[PDB]
Amino acid sequence: PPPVRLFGVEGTYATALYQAAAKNSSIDAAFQSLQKVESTVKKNPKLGHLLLNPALSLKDRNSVIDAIVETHKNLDGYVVNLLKVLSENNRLGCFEKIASDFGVLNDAHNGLLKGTVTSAEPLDPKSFKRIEKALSASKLVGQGKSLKLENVVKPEIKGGLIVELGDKTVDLSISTKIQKLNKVLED
Amino acid sequence: SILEERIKGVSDEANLNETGRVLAVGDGIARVFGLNNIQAEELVEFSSGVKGMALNLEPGQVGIVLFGSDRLVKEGELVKRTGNIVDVPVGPGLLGRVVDALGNPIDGKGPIDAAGRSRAQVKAPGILPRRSVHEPVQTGLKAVDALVPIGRGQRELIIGDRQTGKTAVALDTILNQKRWNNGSDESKKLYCVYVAVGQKRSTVAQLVQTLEQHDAMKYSIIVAATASEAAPLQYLAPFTAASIGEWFRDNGKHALIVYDDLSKQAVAYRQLSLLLRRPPGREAYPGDVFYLHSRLLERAAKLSEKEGSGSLTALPVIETQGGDVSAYIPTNVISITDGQIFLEAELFYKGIRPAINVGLSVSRVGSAAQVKALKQVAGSLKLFLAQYREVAAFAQFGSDLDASTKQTLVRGERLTQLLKQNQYSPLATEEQVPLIYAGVNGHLDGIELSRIGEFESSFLSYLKSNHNELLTEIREKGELSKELLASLKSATESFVAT
Amino acid sequence: TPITGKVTAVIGAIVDVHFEQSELPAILNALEIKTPQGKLVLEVAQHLGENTVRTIAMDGTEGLVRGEKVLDTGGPISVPVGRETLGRIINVIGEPIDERGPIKSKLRKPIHADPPSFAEQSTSAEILETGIKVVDLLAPYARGGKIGLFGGAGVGKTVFIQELINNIAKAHGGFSVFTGVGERTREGNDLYREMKETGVINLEGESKVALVFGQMNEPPGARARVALTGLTI
């Protein structure tokens, strides 16, 4: 089956969408149209966030679909069939969830790593770049996979720094060293 | 834009705060989507006409248990919140009234004069607002008074095999509470509140007829939730009886509440819980049935004198199915209650009617609400009976008996005959103390087993004729003086076999 | 009225319909699904949302093609009652299955009804005696009462009841109803025959008896509303 297996629950829709549009080789188109409908979701916040709530009928749900495709005709065509599916399956809470899942799955198919460098402080751009350079230099990036790297500030990380990407982390923390100290100086 | 307008057109257009629209409904347990504002346990008016309390709140669908038939409910209906947790009219007007669970007179004496309303849920008085129990309640059943004396406040559990006239045991208490009712005892009188759950209208009606025959219903309140009546209303029925009682208790008036059958309350809560999809506790009674029962039972109390000194007394009535007490609901209740009053069916057939299984009959905290005279006389009644139990085992081996054992055996048989009573006959303590004196002082040992019943009646007649002064004194002073004891001993001797 | 639905599911004789029209029959309504073999009377018991009810089917489901048109016959099933129900043996639907032909129905009454009120009770005490000694000594009956019998059925249990019919109902002047849920067909045939013979049912002239018979062959759902049907009569 098409690259990158996602075991998403209601993400099975995204997986399906991916393989279906991969086999029709209209995945870039899909991604772009998905961005556009996702944008029109964000740009429809009243009753497009506040009526993603399940209270819609079949008939009323269908008419929400019809209003959305009146707003734009930039649709994959397979995602118009997917829109039909989501209306019929009354999948609406995991609607942006499916969008996110297809986006991740798609841009994984395209290749693009994600990453974050959670820290106790917002690091320099020089730091971002130096670390990004370092990460690309390290055999972790083997090419065919790009990178996103967001340093985030989290008070929770006490001590060190933590680099995260590719399910590979280096987690420097004070806490572990404190732990060893505490245990042995109480025993 | 135009899209948004068309979306707005098909939208709910209600914020669903303080209201919400039904979305499915089957099995009488509705679930509504909305109700963003909603207090728990609140009463919500379905547009069908039904009112329903709310027992399940879920972020999706708030589960409002209907109090009526769902035959007029349909999906997509609106329910508009009453905005009030359930409430009952409480007051003095309830005396001599049958009222249903929702607190509507079903006696057909029309609107109650029950001044005030209260809420079903009321939190029980703490340790601090209470005084120790010390106030007799006499049920006119010799065994009950002597062996398991009931105090005002206390919870004494009536337990035993179903439909052995379990209700009739309780009715006897009501009948002896006729003596206080006639009396000027008011702050010393129990207003008796009989709660009937799961029972047919005709049975209850027969009971009220019996009560009306016995001219007692000038202090009786009958709270009813018949078998026909809804399971939510049935679940709510003990707690709303409790609130009605607490108004009496609050006034400083003493009262007594019979919760018959509490076992049927458990079945009702079982139905609710499993259709609120709550996890089933053992025996399919949810694992918090205990919480419901415990809170209910602890709302009968003997208040402190700063809190008046009012006292609601409770008698829960639990059916034992096959006499099974290891069953979850009986086990739970036994722990909760401050007495157990096991009845025995075999002994019912043996002719103790009421038949109290006196070995398993306990008053957990015991005696402190027992007549002083009656404390003296029934002192060794227990010892004799205990010896009798051992002796009886030997006696049923049916061999030649130790002479000592035959003293026990002969006395023991008479004791059993003293225990035997006849349903719907209450008895005055002033004349029950003599009978126990006679028995314990072995004057009954002489007279043959058959004619003990004759002796009791005749002896009482003799005392009524001659030592009627003695009876008056026993009534007045409630403890036996040396002079009274001597008079009584002499009297028994005088009428020993006539 | 014509309120369409389709049969989404047939999970046993607890069919689920989807009333396409948002006009949704209320709970305890009755529906007719037309079939080549008669029709099926179904009774709405849940609304499961999205205009999909779940309906008890009072007839034995088979043959059903997934997505079958429905028509709403509305309300609780209204049986036909009368003096012309006397003599008759009536189906759950109310159809005279002893084929003494159609009931000339005066009143057709809803299956569901509500029990009389506490104040409406009239509490009797009039002794009814059978002439059975053990009954008389140990548990004497009362006319208008509620009598109960327990243990293994048709262990002569049925015979015991038959003896009661023989005694008590040949000493009762009023009407009498025999309703046998899960009745043994041969016993029922005998009873019907006996009743006709003892004039209790007399084919010509009046019958002081009416009959409802529910065989245990009939699907559970039918058996469930045999009781209610008899109760209406």
Coordinates of N, CA, C and O in Angstrom, one line a residue, chain C residues 107-222:
Chain C
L107 N -66.0 -1.0 18.9 CA -65.0 -0.2 19.4 C -63.8 -0.9 19.0 O -63.7 -2.1 19.2
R108 N -62.7 -0.2 18.5 CA -61.5 -0.7 18.3 C -60.7 0.0 19.3 O -60.8 1.2 19.4
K109 N -59.9 -0.6 20.2 CA -59.3 0.0 21.3 C -57.8 -0.1 21.3 O -57.4 -1.2 21.0
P110 N -57.0 0.9 21.7 CA -55.6 0.8 21.8 C -55.1 -0.3 22.7 O -55.7 -0.5 23.7
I111 N -54.0 -1.0 22.3 CA -53.4 -2.1 23.1 C -52.8 -1.5 24.4 O -53.0 -2.2 25.4
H112 N -52.2 -0.3 24.4 CA -51.7 0.3 25.5 C -52.8 1.1 26.2 O -53.6 1.7 25.5
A113 N -52.8 1.0 27.5 CA -53.8 1.7 28.3 C -53.2 1.8 29.7 O -52.1 1.2 29.9
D114 N -53.8 2.6 30.6 CA -53.1 2.9 31.8 C -54.0 2.4 33.0 O -55.2 2.4 32.9
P115 N -53.4 1.8 34.0 CA -54.1 1.2 35.1 C -54.9 2.2 35.9 O -54.4 3.3 36.1
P116 N -56.1 1.9 36.4 CA -56.9 2.8 37.2 C -56.2 3.3 38.4 O -55.3 2.7 38.9
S117 N -56.7 4.5 38.9 CA -56.0 5.3 39.9 C -56.3 4.7 41.2 O -57.2 3.8 41.4
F118 N -55.5 5.1 42.3 CA -55.6 4.7 43.6 C -57.0 5.0 44.2 O -57.6 4.2 44.9
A119 N -57.5 6.2 43.9 CA -58.8 6.6 44.3 C -59.9 5.8 43.6 O -61.0 5.7 44.2
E120 N -59.7 5.3 42.4 CA -60.7 4.6 41.6 C -60.8 3.2 42.0 O -61.8 2.6 41.7
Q121 N -59.9 2.7 42.9 CA -59.9 1.4 43.4 C -61.2 1.1 44.2 O -61.6 2.0 44.9
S122 N -61.8 -0.1 44.0 CA -62.9 -0.5 44.9 C -62.3 -1.8 45.3 O -62.1 -2.7 44.5
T123 N -62.0 -1.9 46.6 CA -61.3 -3.1 47.2 C -62.3 -4.0 47.7 O -63.1 -3.7 48.6
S124 N -62.4 -5.2 47.1 CA -63.3 -6.3 47.4 C -62.8 -7.2 48.5 O -61.7 -6.9 49.1
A125 N -63.6 -8.2 48.9 CA -63.3 -9.1 50.0 C -64.2 -10.3 49.9 O -64.2 -11.2 50.7
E126 N -65.1 -10.3 48.9 CA -66.1 -11.4 48.6 C -65.4 -12.7 48.3 O -64.7 -12.7 47.4
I127 N -65.6 -13.7 49.2 CA -65.2 -15.0 49.1 C -65.6 -15.7 47.8 O -66.8 -15.7 47.5
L128 N -64.7 -16.3 47.1 CA -64.9 -17.2 46.0 C -64.4 -18.5 46.4 O -63.3 -18.5 46.9
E129 N -65.2 -19.6 46.2 CA -64.8 -20.9 46.7 C -64.8 -21.7 45.4 O -65.4 -21.3 44.4
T130 N -64.0 -22.8 45.4 CA -63.9 -23.6 44.2 C -64.5 -24.9 44.5 O -65.2 -25.4 43.6
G131 N -64.4 -25.4 45.7 CA -64.9 -26.7 46.1 C -63.7 -27.7 46.2 O -63.8 -28.8 46.5
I132 N -62.5 -27.1 45.9 CA -61.3 -27.9 46.1 C -60.9 -27.6 47.5 O -60.9 -26.5 48.0
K133 N -60.7 -28.7 48.3 CA -60.6 -28.6 49.7 C -59.3 -28.0 50.1 O -59.3 -27.1 51.0
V134 N -58.2 -28.3 49.5 CA -56.9 -27.8 49.8 C -56.8 -26.3 49.6 O -56.3 -25.6 50.4
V135 N -57.4 -25.9 48.5 CA -57.6 -24.5 48.2 C -58.4 -23.8 49.2 O -58.1 -22.7 49.7
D136 N -59.6 -24.4 49.6 CA -60.5 -23.7 50.5 C -59.9 -23.6 51.9 O -60.0 -22.5 52.5
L137 N -59.2 -24.6 52.4 CA -58.6 -24.6 53.7 C -57.5 -23.7 53.8 O -57.3 -23.0 54.8
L138 N -56.6 -23.7 52.8 CA -55.3 -23.1 52.9 C -55.3 -21.7 52.3 O -54.5 -20.9 52.8
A139 N -56.0 -21.5 51.2 CA -55.9 -20.2 50.6 C -57.2 -19.9 49.9 O -57.2 -19.9 48.6
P140 N -58.3 -19.6 50.5 CA -59.6 -19.4 49.9 C -59.6 -18.2 49.0 O -58.9 -17.2 49.4
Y141 N -60.2 -18.3 47.8 CA -60.1 -17.2 46.8 C -61.2 -16.2 47.2 O -61.9 -16.3 48.1
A142 N -61.2 -15.1 46.3 CA -62.1 -14.0 46.5 C -62.5 -13.6 45.1 O -61.6 -13.6 44.2
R143 N -63.7 -13.3 44.8 CA -64.2 -13.1 43.4 C -63.8 -11.6 43.1 O -64.1 -10.7 43.9
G144 N -63.1 -11.5 42.0 CA -62.6 -10.2 41.5 C -61.1 -10.2 41.8 O -60.4 -9.2 41.4
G145 N -60.6 -11.2 42.6 CA -59.3 -11.2 43.1 C -58.2 -11.5 42.1 O -58.5 -11.5 40.9
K146 N -57.0 -11.6 42.6 CA -55.8 -11.9 41.8 C -55.3 -13.2 42.3 O -54.7 -13.2 43.4
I147 N -55.3 -14.3 41.5 CA -55.0 -15.6 42.0 C -53.8 -15.9 41.2 O -53.5 -15.2 40.2
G148 N -52.9 -16.8 41.7 CA -51.6 -17.0 41.2 C -51.3 -18.4 41.4 O -51.6 -19.0 42.4
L149 N -50.5 -19.0 40.5 CA -50.2 -20.4 40.5 C -48.8 -20.4 39.9 O -48.4 -19.5 39.1
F150 N -47.9 -21.3 40.4 CA -46.5 -21.3 40.1 C -46.1 -22.7 40.0 O -46.9 -23.6 40.2
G151 N -44.8 -22.9 39.6 CA -44.3 -24.2 39.3 C -44.3 -24.5 37.9 O -44.7 -23.7 37.1
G152 N -43.9 -25.8 37.5 CA -43.8 -26.3 36.2 C -45.2 -26.2 35.6 O -46.1 -26.6 36.2
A153 N -45.3 -25.7 34.4 CA -46.5 -25.5 33.6 C -46.7 -26.8 32.8 O -45.8 -27.4 32.3
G154 N -48.0 -27.1 32.6 CA -48.4 -28.3 32.0 C -47.8 -29.5 32.6 O -47.5 -30.5 31.9
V155 N -47.7 -29.5 33.9 CA -47.2 -30.7 34.6 C -48.5 -31.3 35.2 O -48.5 -31.8 36.3
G156 N -49.6 -30.9 34.6 CA -50.9 -31.0 35.1 C -51.3 -29.7 35.6 O -52.3 -29.5 36.1
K157 N -50.3 -28.7 35.4 CA -50.5 -27.3 35.8 C -51.6 -26.8 35.0 O -52.5 -26.2 35.5
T158 N -51.6 -27.1 33.7 CA -52.6 -26.7 32.7 C -53.9 -27.3 33.1 O -54.9 -26.6 33.2
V159 N -53.8 -28.6 33.5 CA -55.0 -29.4 34.0 C -55.6 -28.7 35.2 O -56.8 -28.7 35.3
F160 N -54.8 -28.2 36.1 CA -55.2 -27.6 37.4 C -56.1 -26.4 37.0 O -57.2 -26.3 37.5
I161 N -55.6 -25.6 36.1 CA -56.2 -24.4 35.6 C -57.5 -24.8 34.9 O -58.6 -24.2 35.2
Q162 N -57.5 -25.9 34.2 CA -58.7 -26.4 33.5 C -59.8 -26.8 34.4 O -60.9 -26.6 34.2
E163 N -59.4 -27.4 35.6 CA -60.2 -27.8 36.6 C -60.9 -26.5 37.2 O -62.1 -26.5 37.4
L164 N -60.1 -25.4 37.3 CA -60.6 -24.2 37.8 C -61.6 -23.6 36.8 O -62.7 -23.2 37.3
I165 N -61.4 -23.8 35.5 CA -62.3 -23.3 34.5 C -63.6 -24.1 34.7 O -64.7 -23.6 34.6
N166 N -63.4 -25.4 34.9 CA -64.5 -26.3 35.0 C -65.4 -26.0 36.2 O -66.6 -26.2 36.2
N167 N -64.7 -25.6 37.3 CA -65.4 -25.4 38.6 C -65.9 -23.9 38.6 O -67.1 -23.7 38.6
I168 N -65.0 -23.0 38.7 CA -65.3 -21.6 38.9 C -66.0 -21.0 37.8 O -66.9 -20.2 38.0
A169 N -65.7 -21.4 36.5 CA -66.4 -20.7 35.4 C -67.7 -21.4 35.1 O -68.5 -20.8 34.4
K170 N -68.0 -22.5 35.7 CA -69.3 -23.1 35.7 C -69.8 -22.8 37.1 O -70.0 -23.7 37.8
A171 N -69.8 -21.5 37.4 CA -70.4 -21.0 38.6 C -70.2 -19.5 38.5 O -70.5 -18.8 39.4
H172 N -69.6 -19.0 37.4 CA -69.5 -17.6 37.2 C -70.5 -17.3 36.1 O -70.6 -18.0 35.1
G173 N -71.2 -16.2 36.3 CA -72.3 -15.8 35.4 C -71.8 -14.8 34.4 O -72.3 -14.8 33.3
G174 N -70.8 -13.9 34.8 CA -70.3 -12.9 34.0 C -69.5 -13.5 32.8 O -69.4 -14.7 32.6
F175 N -68.7 -12.6 32.1 CA -67.9 -13.0 31.0 C -66.7 -13.6 31.6 O -66.4 -13.6 32.8
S176 N -65.9 -14.3 30.7 CA -64.7 -14.9 31.2 C -63.8 -14.9 30.0 O -64.2 -15.2 28.8
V177 N -62.4 -14.8 30.2 CA -61.5 -14.7 29.2 C -60.5 -15.7 29.5 O -60.1 -15.9 30.6
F178 N -60.1 -16.5 28.4 CA -59.0 -17.4 28.6 C -58.0 -16.8 27.6 O -58.3 -16.6 26.4
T179 N -56.8 -16.6 28.0 CA -55.7 -16.1 27.3 C -54.6 -17.0 27.7 O -54.3 -17.2 28.8
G180 N -54.0 -17.6 26.6 CA -53.0 -18.6 26.9 C -51.8 -18.2 26.1 O -51.8 -18.4 24.9
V181 N -50.7 -17.8 26.8 CA -49.5 -17.4 26.1 C -48.7 -18.6 26.0 O -48.5 -19.3 27.0
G182 N -48.2 -18.9 24.8 CA -47.3 -20.1 24.7 C -48.1 -21.4 24.9 O -47.5 -22.3 25.3
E183 N -49.4 -21.3 24.6 CA -50.3 -22.5 24.7 C -49.9 -23.6 23.7 O -49.5 -23.4 22.6
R184 N -50.2 -24.8 24.2 CA -49.8 -26.1 23.6 C -51.0 -26.2 22.7 O -52.1 -26.3 23.2
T185 N -50.8 -26.3 21.4 CA -51.8 -26.2 20.4 C -52.8 -27.3 20.5 O -54.0 -27.0 20.4
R186 N -52.4 -28.5 20.8 CA -53.3 -29.6 21.0 C -54.2 -29.4 22.2 O -55.4 -29.6 22.1
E187 N -53.7 -28.9 23.3 CA -54.4 -28.6 24.5 C -55.4 -27.6 24.2 O -56.6 -27.6 24.7
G188 N -55.0 -26.5 23.4 CA -55.9 -25.5 23.0 C -57.0 -25.9 22.2 O -58.1 -25.4 22.3
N189 N -56.8 -26.8 21.2 CA -57.8 -27.4 20.4 C -58.8 -28.2 21.2 O -60.0 -28.1 20.9
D190 N -58.3 -28.9 22.2 CA -59.1 -29.6 23.1 C -60.0 -28.7 23.9 O -61.2 -28.9 24.0
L191 N -59.4 -27.6 24.4 CA -60.1 -26.7 25.2 C -61.2 -26.0 24.5 O -62.3 -25.8 25.0
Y192 N -60.9 -25.6 23.2 CA -61.8 -24.9 22.3 C -63.0 -25.8 22.0 O -64.1 -25.4 22.1
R193 N -62.6 -27.1 21.8 CA -63.6 -28.1 21.5 C -64.5 -28.3 22.7 O -65.7 -28.4 22.5
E194 N -63.9 -28.4 23.9 CA -64.6 -28.6 25.1 C -65.5 -27.5 25.4 O -66.7 -27.7 25.8
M195 N -65.0 -26.3 25.2 CA -65.8 -25.1 25.4 C -67.0 -25.0 24.5 O -68.1 -24.7 25.0
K196 N -66.8 -25.4 23.3 CA -67.9 -25.4 22.3 C -68.9 -26.5 22.7 O -70.1 -26.2 22.6
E197 N -68.4 -27.6 23.2 CA -69.2 -28.7 23.7 C -70.0 -28.4 24.9 O -71.1 -28.9 25.1
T198 N -69.4 -27.6 25.9 CA -70.1 -27.3 27.1 C -70.9 -26.1 27.0 O -71.4 -25.6 28.0
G199 N -71.0 -25.5 25.8 CA -72.0 -24.5 25.5 C -71.5 -23.1 25.9 O -72.0 -22.1 25.6
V200 N -70.3 -23.1 26.6 CA -69.6 -22.0 27.2 C -69.2 -21.1 26.1 O -69.5 -19.9 26.1
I201 N -68.8 -21.7 24.9 CA -68.8 -21.2 23.6 C -69.9 -22.0 23.0 O -70.0 -23.2 23.2
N202 N -70.8 -21.4 22.3 CA -71.8 -22.1 21.5 C -71.7 -21.3 20.2 O -72.0 -20.1 20.3
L203 N -71.5 -21.9 19.1 CA -71.2 -21.3 17.8 C -72.4 -20.5 17.4 O -72.2 -19.4 16.9
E204 N -73.6 -21.1 17.5 CA -74.8 -20.5 17.4 C -75.1 -20.0 18.8 O -74.8 -20.6 19.7
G205 N -75.7 -18.8 18.9 CA -76.1 -18.2 20.1 C -74.8 -17.7 20.8 O -73.7 -17.9 20.3
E206 N -75.0 -17.0 21.9 CA -74.0 -16.4 22.7 C -73.1 -17.3 23.4 O -73.4 -18.5 23.7
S207 N -71.9 -16.8 23.7 CA -70.8 -17.4 24.3 C -70.5 -16.5 25.4 O -70.5 -15.2 25.2
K208 N -70.4 -16.9 26.7 CA -70.0 -16.1 27.8 C -68.6 -16.1 28.0 O -68.0 -15.7 29.0
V209 N -67.8 -16.7 27.0 CA -66.4 -16.8 26.9 C -66.0 -16.1 25.7 O -66.6 -16.2 24.6
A210 N -64.7 -15.6 25.7 CA -64.0 -15.1 24.6 C -62.7 -15.7 24.8 O -62.4 -16.2 25.8
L211 N -61.9 -15.8 23.7 CA -60.6 -16.5 23.7 C -59.6 -15.7 23.0 O -59.9 -15.0 22.0
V212 N -58.4 -15.8 23.5 CA -57.2 -15.3 23.0 C -56.3 -16.5 23.1 O -56.3 -17.2 24.1
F213 N -55.6 -16.8 22.0 CA -54.7 -18.0 22.1 C -53.4 -17.5 21.4 O -53.5 -16.9 20.3
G214 N -52.3 -17.8 22.0 CA -51.0 -17.4 21.6 C -50.2 -18.6 21.7 O -50.2 -19.2 22.8
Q215 N -49.6 -19.1 20.6 CA -48.9 -20.4 20.6 C -47.5 -20.0 20.8 O -47.1 -18.9 20.6
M216 N -46.7 -21.0 21.3 CA -45.3 -20.7 21.7 C -44.5 -20.7 20.5 O -43.3 -20.2 20.5
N217 N -45.0 -21.3 19.4 CA -44.4 -21.2 18.1 C -44.2 -19.7 17.6 O -43.1 -19.4 17.2
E218 N -45.2 -18.9 17.9 CA -45.3 -17.5 17.5 C -44.1 -16.8 18.0 O -43.7 -17.0 19.2
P219 N -43.4 -15.9 17.3 CA -42.2 -15.3 17.7 C -42.3 -14.5 18.9 O -43.4 -14.1 19.2
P220 N -41.2 -14.2 19.7 CA -41.3 -13.7 21.0 C -42.1 -12.5 21.1 O -42.8 -12.3 22.1
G221 N -41.9 -11.6 20.1 CA -42.5 -10.3 20.1 C -44.0 -10.3 20.0 O -44.7 -9.6 20.7
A222 N -44.5 -11.3 19.3 CA -45.9 -11.6 19.2 C -46.4 -11.9 20.6 O -47.4 -11.4 21.0

